[PDB]
Amino acid sequence: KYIEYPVLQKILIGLILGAIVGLILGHYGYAHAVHTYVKPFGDLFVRLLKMLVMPIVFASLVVGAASISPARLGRVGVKIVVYYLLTSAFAVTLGIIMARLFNPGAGIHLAVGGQQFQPHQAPPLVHILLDIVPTNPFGALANGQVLPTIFFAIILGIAITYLMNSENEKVRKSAETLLDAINGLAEAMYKIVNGVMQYAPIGVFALIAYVMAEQGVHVVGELAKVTAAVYVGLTLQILLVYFVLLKIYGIDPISFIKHAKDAMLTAFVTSSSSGTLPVTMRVAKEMGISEGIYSFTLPLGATINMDGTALYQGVATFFIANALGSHLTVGQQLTIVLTAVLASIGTAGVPGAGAIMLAMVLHSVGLPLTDPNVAAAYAMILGIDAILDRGRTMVNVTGDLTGTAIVAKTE
Amino acid sequence: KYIEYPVLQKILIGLILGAIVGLILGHYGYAHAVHTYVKPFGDLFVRLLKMLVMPIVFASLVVGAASISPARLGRVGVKIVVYYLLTSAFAVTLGIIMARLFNPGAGIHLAVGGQQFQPHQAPPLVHILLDIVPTNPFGALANGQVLPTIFFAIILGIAITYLMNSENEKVRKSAETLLDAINGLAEAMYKIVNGVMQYAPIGVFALIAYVMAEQGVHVVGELAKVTAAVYVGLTLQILLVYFVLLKIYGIDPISFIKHAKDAMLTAFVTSSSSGTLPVTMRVAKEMGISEGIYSFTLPLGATINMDGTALYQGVATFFIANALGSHLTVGQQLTIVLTAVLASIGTAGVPGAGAIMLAMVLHSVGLPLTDPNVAAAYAMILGIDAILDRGRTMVNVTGDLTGTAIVAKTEGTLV
Amino acid sequence: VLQKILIGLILGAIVGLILGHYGYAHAVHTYVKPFGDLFVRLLKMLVMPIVFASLVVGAASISPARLGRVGVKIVVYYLLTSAFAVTLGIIMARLFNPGAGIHLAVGGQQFQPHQAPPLVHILLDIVPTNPFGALANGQVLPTIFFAIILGIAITYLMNSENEKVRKSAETLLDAINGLAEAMYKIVNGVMQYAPIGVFALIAYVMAEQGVHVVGELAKVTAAVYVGLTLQILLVYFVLLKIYGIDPISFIKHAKDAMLTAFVTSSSSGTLPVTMRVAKEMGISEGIYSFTLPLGATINMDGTALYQGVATFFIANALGSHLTVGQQLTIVLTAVLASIGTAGVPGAGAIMLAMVLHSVGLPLTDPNVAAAYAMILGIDAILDRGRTMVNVTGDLTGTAIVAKTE
Ligand SMILES: N[C@@H](CC(=O)O)C(=O)O
Ligand SMILES: N[C@@H](CC(=O)O)C(=O)O
Ligand SMILES: N[C@@H](CC(=O)O)C(=O)O
Ligand code: NA
Ligand code: NA
Ligand code: NA
Ligand code: NA
Ligand code: NA
Ligand code: NA
């Protein structure tokens, strides 16, 4: 009774099997059953994603503050970042534009707790800007609030790279040993991470088994409404940005696609900016780009500059809002712009943590995942991430290929 | 004004001196005094036991997940574990049977806070099975809830033994240094542990000084009711299990006891599965058992398979329940079976943390130690653990001697 | 660093009465507040980790083991000097009355001094029931009793028979220490916001009652300074003279270990300097080689006195008559703070943190905290002045103990 299988199908057959199993259960008779039996395995999966973050988000971002230690020369790739921001900023814009045309979410009245979502109005920015600084990092980290457990983790690890340097030898030996422990927790988390991706097949099955039992069936159409709103928005900015800003330069925008070939192919199948990096790296070499340019910019387009993930989140948010029976207002709309950018700037680049960074793009713009109406809707859109992750990644990689080819004009 | 003394008497003379001091105080006059003066040193001791666990239970169980790392060959001692479960399962059964015959607890109406225990009914298993997974390990660990601070500590340390292996050299150097820190906290805890066992003489005195002042005196008889319910249950399964399943095999069950001699003796005096392990190890060699058998099984009967501790907890629970004025219901009864097994599978094997694993066998089956009625009763039974620990351990060791001798009938040899 | 906060102090003093008249409405009390407050929190962050990390180090620092005979003599001395220092601070905070002449009301509802819980129940709640919890949500008096009992227990693990257990004990302590340091790195960075946030908070609390509040903080300055110099004469020049050692020429071959202590304001920087100085005044190796590094982190004479004044300052600033017993608790607290204080620049003031938490004056109360903001504000003055003694006090001890053959 054994586990072996390439998981990113295991989940996807979990999904299509879940969808097809779900629909046929609630229809035929026992609309309940699944709520009492199956859902509790989705409830499980959910929890395990959350079990992560806090350690991962601490540990990782202490490492990624020893990784970047001044000198951290952002004095020649000013050009590339300036570009990356605008594309990602325009991507989420385009997502909100696509979540206008299509209205995913509406046509579902999620009541969950015998009671629909009421939106609790945001506190002043004074008070939230100040509550990036923890009053006690341990507390902040502990009970769970994250935006201090960023500001601390960074300010610890940025300060730690001035201790390995310090005059004293034994102080540098102390600074090291702490960082050598924090890192490794980072890794140990990543070892459990993979193991959660091994329960992910069960998890996803149980989620969109429940959704398709309780609340049929033009919820299918609704989630397929997302699929399009995402997809013919993704492909709607490949034409509207890349094919545009390359043409309006002088670079050949059409044959660019042909010598990006397999950096594009894999991005869709691997669904990873990690896997599609020695492939995107080679592809820049293969279309004949200069070393110090693509050698610095394509690894910075890896973690920074997720164009598709910014757009994906700018749709998912809208989906949730309307699914709750909440008319998502303007300003909030352009907060989502600035939030989804500042999420899809820190999103992972593996498979999952696009959706599990959307997490916070919802927490911002009063829509927290504590409210069960929110969460049960999040469960839906996180359920079908496995579809809109493979499709999404393809752009995240192409957007920093195009930037690397646009900036290749500097001599 | 100096401390030196072999402590496991220091406590026990603390107890008998506490008992004899306590009774004569509340009787003669100042029934109070002790409540204001002496109890606050028992209140202290209690807290220090609790100060522990959370670090120890984390740190230890990250180590004991790097200790067992797949490959962790449970492919030949399937036999021994299969046995161990049934004995421990039947032990707590027998404890609940003994806590039926004897009714310890009842005949005390513990009101503590001017108000008796009311039992708050258990939540669905769905919701408690799910709350083994922490939503935030740090939080879980922090404010104190433990069953996530297990599931995390294990899943960290099990995952950590696939990082020292990992292709990268410097990643294995990072994984090590974390585990080399967590371990050592484990040890540092164990250094305070010993220091608490050095206040334990005071602590125990102060506990069963207070109990014997406020609430005399057929509380003596009540706690002695426990003593028997435990003891003539312990000895009631030596005859009923070991002397039975060895006889119904063909192995000589009576002379087994004679070449176990000093593995039994020390178990009662040392009150330790740690101390009685080179002794139980030798004793298996001395009664002529095969190496690869007792060399693998007697160290696994060390921490897993505590027969007596399972039974002890299956009585202590019942004691508490009835002491509160709470008729401990069935199902709960057989939850105690499954709980006390899954406590006496992880109990320590030093002296204390039989009682301080009962801790959780009470938290399960709605009887938490937050409630002062519970806790003041727990203070009683944890008070006299020093009596029912030495007596208890003797079985915990004998039960995996017998298993090792029962499984010694398997021969043999592969291609 | 000093001349950015003392011109800091007068870009607060005046900008309050020239933007409490020309400066209209909440707008000028906005960017006072947000910048008072993006200090306040930014400050409050530090206290806990530091108080844990530091006091695990200052329990491996003092360990009943390998302290002897060379190291029984020196500590015995160090305790008494630091114990007598904070005594002298409380004596100086008697003569001068800093704090009084300010009625800090903060939350329209001044600090009504809070009456001390039954002592049974607070003595018991020094022992944490779960250190993690205690540390986490913030309560400190357990996060002392644990941190100490961890690091005291840890110095019996590096010793332990097993080699690999000593390698494990080390690596933990080598991580905790370093967090200590990492904190001290942020510490300095907070002292860099201290100008435009602790003389932006000051910007308002010098905007009201101005003709009695500069000269209240300058009242501290003296109470500290002519107490520091008042024990150089009263202890060192005394106990060296009453021995036979030449107490006056001692100062001359300490020269640059004294100089730097005032400019560097660091027991870290003034350690290869104080080390050399002991060599240069011709002290024996195994003596000053063991004692001057133990006078580094243990034995802060000035920091003990500084805290024994700062506390009193705060108390009286609140409208709270700081009672006796509390007075001699401060003696035993400030010693057991200035035994674990950092020896960089900041974490004298950010160990006073806990000497206030002890003796019911916690920093959760905004009346306390806004007053702490004042005295932590001008630490940059009384840190350079303070350090000079912290170093001289273990030079003198090293020279006093140099008489053993
Ligand atoms: N699938 C994304 C990462 C994510 O958003 O989860 C990528 O690799 O680009
Ligand atoms: N005394 C037991 C351990 C315990 O239950 O506390 C043993 O060593 O077997
Ligand atoms: N400035 C002190 C340290 C402190 O109290 O912050 C020293 O170096 O001695
Ligand atoms: Na990317
Ligand atoms: Na990203
Ligand atoms: Na055993
Ligand atoms: Na056990
Ligand atoms: Na010093
Ligand atoms: Na110090």
Coordinates of N, CA, C and O and ligand atoms in Angstrom, one line a residue, chain C residues 265-268 300 303 341-349 379 383 386-387 390-391, ligand 3:
Chain C
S265 N 32.7 54.6 25.1 CA 31.5 54.2 25.9 C 31.3 52.7 25.8 O 30.1 52.2 25.7
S266 N 32.4 51.9 25.7 CA 32.3 50.4 25.5 C 33.3 49.7 26.4 O 34.5 50.0 26.4
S267 N 32.8 48.7 27.1 CA 33.7 47.7 27.7 C 34.3 46.7 26.8 O 35.2 45.9 27.1
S268 N 33.7 46.6 25.6 CA 34.3 45.8 24.5 C 35.6 46.5 23.9 O 36.6 45.8 23.7
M300 N 29.7 45.8 36.6 CA 29.5 47.2 36.2 C 29.1 48.0 37.3 O 27.9 48.0 37.8
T303 N 27.0 51.4 36.0 CA 25.7 51.0 35.5 C 24.7 50.6 36.6 O 23.6 50.9 36.5
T341 N 24.1 43.2 32.3 CA 24.1 44.2 31.3 C 25.2 44.0 30.3 O 26.1 43.2 30.5
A342 N 25.0 44.6 29.1 CA 25.7 44.2 27.9 C 27.2 44.6 27.9 O 28.1 43.7 27.9
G343 N 27.5 45.9 28.0 CA 28.9 46.3 27.8 C 29.1 46.7 26.4 O 30.3 46.8 25.9
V344 N 28.0 47.1 25.7 CA 28.2 47.8 24.4 C 27.8 49.3 24.7 O 28.5 49.9 25.6
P345 N 26.9 50.0 24.0 CA 26.5 51.3 24.6 C 25.1 51.3 25.2 O 24.9 51.9 26.2
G346 N 24.1 50.6 24.6 CA 22.7 50.9 24.9 C 22.3 50.2 26.2 O 21.8 50.8 27.1
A347 N 22.6 48.9 26.2 CA 21.8 47.9 27.1 C 22.2 48.0 28.6 O 22.1 47.1 29.4
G348 N 22.7 49.2 29.0 CA 22.5 49.7 30.4 C 21.1 50.2 30.7 O 20.5 49.8 31.6
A349 N 20.7 51.1 29.8 CA 19.3 51.6 29.9 C 18.3 50.5 29.7 O 17.2 50.5 30.3
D379 N 20.3 58.8 27.7 CA 21.2 57.7 28.0 C 22.6 58.0 27.3 O 23.6 57.7 27.8
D383 N 25.9 57.5 29.4 CA 26.5 56.2 29.0 C 28.0 56.3 28.8 O 28.8 55.5 29.3
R386 N 29.1 57.0 32.2 CA 28.9 55.8 33.0 C 30.0 54.8 32.8 O 30.7 54.3 33.8
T387 N 30.3 54.4 31.6 CA 31.2 53.3 31.2 C 32.6 53.5 31.9 O 33.1 52.5 32.4
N390 N 32.7 51.6 35.1 CA 32.6 50.2 34.9 C 33.9 49.5 34.6 O 34.0 48.3 34.9
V391 N 34.8 50.2 33.9 CA 36.1 49.7 33.5 C 37.1 49.9 34.7 O 37.9 49.1 35.0
Ligands
LIG3 N1 28.1 51.5 28.3 C1 28.3 50.3 29.2 C2 27.3 49.3 28.8 C3 25.8 49.6 29.2 O1 25.6 49.8 30.4 O2 25.0 49.8 28.3 C4 29.7 49.8 29.1 O3 30.3 49.6 28.1 O4 30.3 49.6 30.2

